[PDB]
Amino acid sequence: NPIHDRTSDYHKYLKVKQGDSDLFKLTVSDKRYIWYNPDPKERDSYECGEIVSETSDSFTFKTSDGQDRQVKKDDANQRNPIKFDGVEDMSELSYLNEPAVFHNLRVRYNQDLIYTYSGLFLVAVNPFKRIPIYTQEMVDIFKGRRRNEVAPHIFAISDVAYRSMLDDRQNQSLLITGESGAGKTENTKKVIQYLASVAGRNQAGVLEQQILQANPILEAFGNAKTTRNNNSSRFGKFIEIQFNNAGFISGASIQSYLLEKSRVVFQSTSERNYHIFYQLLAGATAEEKKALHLAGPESFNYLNQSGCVDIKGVSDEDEFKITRQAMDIVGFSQEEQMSIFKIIAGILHLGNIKFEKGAGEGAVLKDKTALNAASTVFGVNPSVLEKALMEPRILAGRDLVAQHLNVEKSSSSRDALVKALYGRLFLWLVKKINNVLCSERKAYFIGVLDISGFEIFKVNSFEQLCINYTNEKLQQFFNHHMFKVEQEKYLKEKINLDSQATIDLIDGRQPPGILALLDEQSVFPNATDNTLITKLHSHFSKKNAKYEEPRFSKTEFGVTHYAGQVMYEIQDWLEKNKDPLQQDLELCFKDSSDNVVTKLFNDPNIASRAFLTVAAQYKEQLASLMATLETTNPHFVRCIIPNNKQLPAKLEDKVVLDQLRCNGVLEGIRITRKGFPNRIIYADFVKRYYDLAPNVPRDAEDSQKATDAVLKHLNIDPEQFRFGITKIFFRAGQLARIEEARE
């Protein structure tokens, strides 16, 4: 039992190291500390100041420099007793303030303990280095173990979900959120690995293997190197791991959301386009290249712009193999693989099209190589394509007349074509995989949601509003959940909004919210960003409290979200809402000779939305997701990025705290701390504090009696504590004081 084996990797990597003695006595000290900001120029940077004296109303402490300051007792961030340093659950801290919470996390992270509970949450800080805690051997130890029986780990929460599912006969969910680069995807993969192991059909698993192999496929197509993460997920996902009544994996399903189609045509400097582009061009056999008109990334417009074509310590060609390998396992026919790659090629081809002017104002294609190349790979007719691009037929009422688009318009059209192809292929890939894995007859499921938390960037656009909208919903679901769960707990022992307004501002029907207004402007071909933003301010500036019209910007607006105010820019929202593609182009592609291509334009389930707008579909999909969640027993993982540089051993208070503020961890604690944060099992209490009362012995039968003895001895303030059927409930700071009590 590595759990009992203080020499195991289990103890080494998941636990705070334990010495010989446990004796209350060791941890003894006269000093009493406080956390203070070594200056409010900061606020997240704190220092430990020893309290040198106090008044009936405040404290006076010394600083690091030796400077003596004073603080209101009522404003003081008391430091928890050293014994509390490193606890596995922040719910165990007596003093539940910000700096204190950060401090526990940091003490843990300093020992490479990246997982910590906070009440209902599992907090996970990216180590930005390898920690060998995800082995089969580590898998093995979390089997059937209670949360309180093993160290914090993603495996642990995974096991608890699996057990609850079987014991309660209730579906489960794991919501894994946080910023880009926080560790969501990695943690998601671990949940699945874990489940695959505890519930897979042993012997050697085919379905299991296919389930495992779907990720890789999806990541090649939906993941890219960004400035925040080398393997950034540019789509959100909800994976449903399906089980039969026996608790064995019976299948799975994947739901994808918000794929960043725009990255296909444009990438910021240092970033890359989707991985597959590089995989194909590196891994294609000199023979497939020829057949694909493939060259180097530098030869491609869509890949030669960012300046970055490789990922440190990443072999595209080696990855291509892995990719093709997975497609094989899942079950992509060579023929299908061919066409997917052809689509990939084609898109690269479309990007190399260079529209020219002169003649007049309308665009011309002096050179058609690229065109020819895309047409071939795609299996469409070049001339048709050609005209569909520059001379699309447009409906002027009764009139359907071809228009001669200029360069920019021609260019944008081409871009829209590429984005549609890519999004549709991605959707097709998903469905293909679901076909393989998905079971119409499942008994139970454990769903994992891997999606960004709130996004507050330099520039916030429509996709940002979407994600933040989802986030308000998940936060509200958390709050509701925390509410019942806390109530139930109090009930089993015998004890004691705002999200709506924001949600309504965005998704309301009457009065209409942001999305309803957006949709409305959507029917008007001539509407503009200016008409839209004016309408939004018209309805909400000084009229809706969660809304703010900027002092000078004419193109932005602010929303007061759970995580704070977010300023959104309205440019192109109209276009984004419609996601238009010229009919001619649809017509062109519908006639493709390619087996896969045909599906993308011919299968309405793929080729279309319903038509509803992008906003309406987003809202709908979010509502279905929440509906599903509502039916589950949920578990929450908050992934935290330690800094903005992708470095290990560098936990930045400011970076971290901001995350704790936005993600609900601190709020949760604020709330918790208001009641009876500390809840201790009778025997546990006595075991540690028996010696504080001339009366009680370590292991006593009447533990509750024994508890009251110490308390009584100590003469603790009654309203400071609460006798529960099996635990002693303590208000904030109580236990710390007691800890502070002489033997």
Ligand SMILES: CNc1ccccc1C(=O)O[C@H]1C[C@H](n2cnc3c(N)ncnc32)O[C@@H]1COP(=O)(O)OP(=O)(O)O
């Ligand atoms: C296949 N993997 C990649 C492929 C290409 C380049 C980098 C990576 C990528 O995974 O890079 C990773 C891996 C690393 N990481 C996260 N959690 C941990 C963990 N506990 N231990 C160690 N590292 C962690 O941090 C990066 C970001 O994690 P992530 O899970 O992709 O982030 P997100 O929250 O955006 O999904």
Ligand code: BEF
């Ligand atoms: F970049 Be991570 F997938 F949010």
Ligand SMILES: [Mg+2]
């Ligand atoms: Mg990810």
